[PDB]
Design a protein around this ligand. Sequence first.
Ligand SMILES: O=c1ccn([C@@H]2O[C@H](COP(=O)(O)OP(=O)(O)O)[C@@H](O)[C@H]2O)c(=O)[nH]1
Ligand SMILES: O=c1ccn([C@@H]2O[C@H](COP(=O)(O)OP(=O)(O)O)[C@@H](O)[C@H]2O)c(=O)[nH]1
Ligand SMILES: *[C@@H]1O[C@H](CO)[C@@H](O)[C@H](O)[C@H]1NC(=O)/C=C/CCl
Ligand SMILES: *C/C=C/C(=O)N[C@@H]1[C@@H](O)[C@H](O)[C@@H](CO)O[C@H]1*
Lengths: 12, 12, 667, 666
Amino acid sequence: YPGGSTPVSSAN
Amino acid sequence: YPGGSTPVSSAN
Amino acid sequence: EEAVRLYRKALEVFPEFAAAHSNLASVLQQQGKLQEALMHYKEAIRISPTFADAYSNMGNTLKEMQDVQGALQCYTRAIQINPAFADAHSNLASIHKDSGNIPEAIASYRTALKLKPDFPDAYCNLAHCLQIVCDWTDYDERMKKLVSIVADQLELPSVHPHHSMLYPLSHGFRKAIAERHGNLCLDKINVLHKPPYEHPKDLKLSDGRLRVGYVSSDFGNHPTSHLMQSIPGMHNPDKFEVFCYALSPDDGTNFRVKVMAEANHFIDLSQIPCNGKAADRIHQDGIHILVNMNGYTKGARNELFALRPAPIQAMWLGYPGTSGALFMDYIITDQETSPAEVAEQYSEKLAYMPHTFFIGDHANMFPHLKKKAVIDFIYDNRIVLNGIDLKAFLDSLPDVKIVNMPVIPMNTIAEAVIEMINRGQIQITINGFSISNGLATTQINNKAATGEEVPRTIIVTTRSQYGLPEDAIVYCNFNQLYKIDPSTLQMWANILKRVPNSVLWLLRFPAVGEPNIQQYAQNMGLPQNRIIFSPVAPKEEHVRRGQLADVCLDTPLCNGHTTGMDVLWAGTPMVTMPGETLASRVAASQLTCLGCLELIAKNRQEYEDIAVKLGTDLEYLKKVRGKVWKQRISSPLFNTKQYTMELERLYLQMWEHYAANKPDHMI
Amino acid sequence: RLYRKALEVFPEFAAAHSNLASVLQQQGKLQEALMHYKEAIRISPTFADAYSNMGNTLKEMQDVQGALQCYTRAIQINPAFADAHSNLASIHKDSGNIPEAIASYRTALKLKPDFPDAYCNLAHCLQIVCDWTDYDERMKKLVSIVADQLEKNLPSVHPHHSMLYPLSHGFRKAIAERHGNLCLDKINVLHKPPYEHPKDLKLSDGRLRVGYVSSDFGNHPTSHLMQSIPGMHNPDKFEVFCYALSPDDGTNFRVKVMAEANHFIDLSQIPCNGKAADRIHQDGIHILVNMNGYTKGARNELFALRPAPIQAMWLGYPGTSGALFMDYIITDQETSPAEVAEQYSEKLAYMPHTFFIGDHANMFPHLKKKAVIDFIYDNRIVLNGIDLKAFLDSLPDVKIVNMPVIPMNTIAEAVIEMINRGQIQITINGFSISNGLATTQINNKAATGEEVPRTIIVTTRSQYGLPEDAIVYCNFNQLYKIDPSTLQMWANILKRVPNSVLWLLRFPAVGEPNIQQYAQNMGLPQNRIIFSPVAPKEEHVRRGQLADVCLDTPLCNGHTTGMDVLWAGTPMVTMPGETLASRVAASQLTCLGCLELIAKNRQEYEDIAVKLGTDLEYLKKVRGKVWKQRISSPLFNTKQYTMELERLYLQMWEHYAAGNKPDHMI
Ligand SMILES: O=c1ccn([C@@H]2O[C@H](COP(=O)(O)OP(=O)(O)O)[C@@H](O)[C@H]2O)c(=O)[nH]1
Ligand SMILES: O=c1ccn([C@@H]2O[C@H](COP(=O)(O)OP(=O)(O)O)[C@@H](O)[C@H]2O)c(=O)[nH]1
Ligand SMILES: *[C@@H]1O[C@H](CO)[C@@H](O)[C@H](O)[C@H]1NC(=O)/C=C/CCl
Ligand SMILES: *C/C=C/C(=O)N[C@@H]1[C@@H](O)[C@H](O)[C@@H](CO)O[C@H]1*
């Protein structure tokens, strides 16, 4: 998110 | 350097 | 392995062979030896200063070592040396992608395809990029072509298993893709010549307790912790022993802190980077069931599971699909997401949890959202209050009408509140209480905003903060935009035209897909006042703001997973259409558990009918909301204790079986 | 400005939201600013200017992926928005992607040709990669831009770059006074009184209280220079306070300073300049030292509030601050001659020899002594080791010259076999023998300089692709220090000396073909200039020994790089200019006692460098002179430097103690 981070599930 | 960091003098 | 032996002889024969240095360097780079790799690449470049191919492969290593700027200088230097070098362009683009410069990634992917037009890897990569921004030009062609590329390769697949679920592959194709990735992990470990492990066939060394090892790169701030952080500490110490294997460094967060404090044993595999030495340790702990919570997701070290240090190896909750691999024995799932009928997408056997394999620590992390109050001029979702000490504040007030939802009448109290929202000032004091602006959580307490701490003020959430209308139905989907496709947008647009008094609420996730969405929306006869965008919000703001919505429209292609439980927590009904792939049957699983069979659609006409119903039959919406708002507390959905206990039953079941016979489906 | 009154009258006024946000961001209130930018956009969803300004605010909070989305969004709303383009580029420059930096700065220019900030930045990017297309046009245009801007009150040229362009000396000080005055204005916001300063040494028990303020207490050349210093101060007469402006990065450099200063104070924890300056004052500091100037991490707001009575620019910024809050610049007779003290807003305070210092003796003692191999050259195959003597002594035949020489036998062969085969290390007589190129795989803390290495290191010409049979001129600085004049100068040199190569660094790699091309435009084939990679700090100093002579860049010399080169025993040819940044190599050389290496003009420089490449007994002499005097002169002598540095502090104090304003110290 804008300012901080918004961790998500993503591919390796 | 390639593989790491080479810090240097620089502008703010 | 034997490549290494060859190349070193090639260098024995001839000291000065640029290509064989570069080739040695690329295989050392496969087997993780990044420093050594990097050395040989500079030798190659010292020999031949205009060796574009070395510079490009050097950049890859630098990217793996997380030297992003060095990888940048390397790729650029290879493009300088040879401006028609397709790989330098592809690789470059992939840096831009991982930095979220998707427009500049798309440009460089295109440039590859123009230079070397059959380049499957770069096509699939571009196709994922296009998905991220909701660019759907030649969309039907694209899909037809990705099926093709994959069809071909099967006789390493250029589409990632974590992606394969978004595309119209067959289930044979999706399984096949995962199968050739799992196979690649074996080929990495066989280099290590490791004998087979001898597994406990007993519980006698363990003191009668089952040893369960939980491996995840996400014990830290990542959706994995947000869902299961209370599971280790809620296990029964008498009959189970919990080992937590982190694959990542301590990210500093209260999520990490919980799991280290609460597990019986926490082991940091991020400092045991060698897979042999790390799988040795798992075996030395004496694990009986070792659980995989990554599958094919950022962080995974499936090689640990490829060497077989536990008798039973299970997949759980981090990966919405099959691993395709014979080193994984079960997948923890349920009949509502993975019906017995369709067992043959999954290479693993099916272990059923009794309601839903899905869990959430919302009960624990956001408990200020169990109860609410509203402000007047009655609507449950226009101007909302939440607080640990809300009740005290309500009772400090002259007038309040509980309907059970307390309602604050429009007085000089409610004026100071709404004018705070109006000015955008951070907080105010009423009767000595903190009344805080929901848009300013990070200013007041950062760890509250991330969900690390329960908030300690009373927080105000209003539609005016988001530019939502105070006199109309609000539909939301709060996922990343990549899960929306053409069909899905069509459904939403249909609904939006039958329900004139309504706005569909989406997020800039990323903002660079917003113009696309709206363009495509306007091709379907839908004005620009109709779809509202707002930015992605820190975790707690997100979950709270679901209170402003009336109904959430779930993505049929890939459902809300975390995002689903998030919206259910705010007391917002979700309309889903479960598909075929496990990623498309989740919101449905969550709702079967919660107990809203009425919201589960069998087809498109059914879907759109359910949601138009909910947006016009207002008292049906008050009914359904009421039903969700109570059932999140009263059903198994959010109940980490019931969850853990039933999970424990399923584990023993899995042990009893191996105690005799080989892995078989569980009921 | 109370725009907060403006928004009181009107709630949904997008422009004042965007404007309040831009002023909150002035003060440094980033989370608040960020909040009003999202409001601005809630109201007006295609408001480009807010999206782009938003980007600036999130780039400050170091969310770079966040900034990118804001920039590229300002560009999809308005592909004709130049500011958004200039900003997008600026992040590319900081990612080290200089081409995209460039492609994007030109779009800002094509869209808006009166764009000073984006021209000057483009000129820097061009400077970085040594792209000298329309160089003279660019140069004259850069003056005109500043002449114009100075005349209407903030230069698009950063004072740290001012040394790189043909600006006048009056113009230099002015760009510096501007960025300085800007520290003053950002501070007057806080309305603080003047601080009440100490007048004798009585609270402090007779000790002078010194505060060294830096963001470079870590893996940084500042620490590679002055890490020993606080620990060598005299406790009886001095009390030493080190003020970090950087979080602890985990390096030994940080550990060392933390252990040896009497007081280590981590100001990165106190982000408020008001609160941070109050702290410095109550420590009772008599001299507060500015070690950043206008460099990455500066928090000169600290010095703008005057928390200490004497305030001196020392060592980290090679220029004048232009600020009236800085009292002295510690420099020396050779770098800043009193004759030419007009550039300096500060008074001149002199060190006896050089203001320059270097922790090489402590850092790299394995290089005090060296061994070679045969078939006598001192720099074709080199060995270095703490335990070299013992290694040598384990050998059957060793010929002394004081330089040990190992003849060609199975012992000498096994080493060469390792270098040829690119393998990591070997064992001879039980001693550990290492490849110079394999150091991060042997010991990562030895590679950075954080640890003295514990095995013996062999270093060769073959490793970097240099000729066994020709003379090697090196220069080891970042490529942005070279200009046309200079590259011409070295090419001249190189044509006069047929057996020679110039040995150059990829710093950054993308600058190599430019240099290669301009060279050909006057020079010889692509075999005269050899490029090597940037190295680990230790390999970097160590491999310098392979060279015959170093040719220093006149426009801005090696500073840390100068020290680095001399420590290897490699002579340096230099031609002092008129800016402090262009004088430093000559001052270092004066201290070393090699005035015959200082050129008066371009012609001398070519003659000096040619003589060193052709006269080969004169080569042996000056190489000798260096190899010896780096131990015996006061250049790499931190203990001596510390002491005379202490002497100048007292001399500085006693002047002020007499109730005087700062005046020149000689
Ligand atoms: O404004 C928002 C919107 C979403 N999210 C969170 O961001 C993540 C997105 O999750 P993801 O798409 O990776 O997994 P899924 O929903 O597919 O399970 C989820 O953690 C949400 O809780 C958030 O913090 N703020
Ligand atoms: O291959 C190299 C070349 C240089 N350096 C170091 O990189 C820094 C470059 O910074 P800068 O140019 O600011 O030095 P200065 O301007 O003082 O010469 C110096 O410490 C050198 O010690 C390095 O570690 N590896
Ligand atoms: C780099 O850092 C050291 C720290 O003392 C300083 O001595 C050296 O002068 C500095 N280099 C430069 O400022 C180069 C500037 C040209 Cl833009
Ligand atoms: C469309 C697929 C998205 C995805 O990979 N989601 C993951 C969830 O299934 C999983 O439960 C969470 C928690 O670990 O990670 C992301």
